[PDB]
Amino acid sequence: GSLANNIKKSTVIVKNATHIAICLYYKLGETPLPLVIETGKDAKALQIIKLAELYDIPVIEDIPLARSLYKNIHKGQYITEDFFEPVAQLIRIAIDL
Ligand code: PRO
């Protein structure tokens, strides 16, 4: 579960500037719900965002959602029902792209 490999397979990243980055992973047939596969604050959020760019993972800024995911959903956990709609919207955009 190395940082680069996690980002590489991620579906979408949601961010609050350089402070927080949340890497979400959803694949029908593999994940029953979107999974928080990687998270970072500060230097680590910066690392995530540069790797995202290198691997062409869509990065969407949403400050309240990035904040709330970071507070509530730890790396390696699925999202909770609170997040289903908002994260479903972010996944559809990533698919759009
Ligand atoms: O400090 C926080 O807000 C988050 C909670 C889970 C991991 N870090």
Side-chain angles (χ1 to χ4, degrees):
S2 88
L3 181 62
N5 275 333
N6 280 344
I7 305 296
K8 181 169 167 43
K9 76 183 207 170
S10 281
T11 306
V12 62
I13 294 165
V14 57
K15 70 164 186 187
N16 160 206
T18 57
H19 310 296
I20 297 161
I22 307 299
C23 307
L24 290 153
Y25 182 58
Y26 178 76
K27 185 161 181 56
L28 190 64
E30 179 173 357
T31 60
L33 295 173
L35 173 68
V36 175
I37 57 161
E38 196 61 80
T39 67
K41 69 187 180 319
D42 303 341
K44 193 175 176 203
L46 246 26
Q47 197 103 154
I48 289 168
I49 291 166
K50 194 129 137 183
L51 293 165
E53 328 283 86
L54 214 30
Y55 290 123
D56 301 338
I57 315 295
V59 178
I60 289 56
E61 177 165 84
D62 184 334
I63 301 165
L65 178 52
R67 281 182 178 146
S68 175
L69 283 162
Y70 190 77
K71 172 158 297 208
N72 288 298
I73 314 291
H74 298 245
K75 173 176 172 183
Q77 295 198 296
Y78 293 115
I79 66 171
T80 57
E81 66 183 303
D82 207 21
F83 294 104
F84 286 171
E85 187 251 43
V87 170
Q89 286 182 310
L90 282 177
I91 296 158
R92 288 190 295 270
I93 298 175
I95 293 167
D96 279 2
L97 318 185

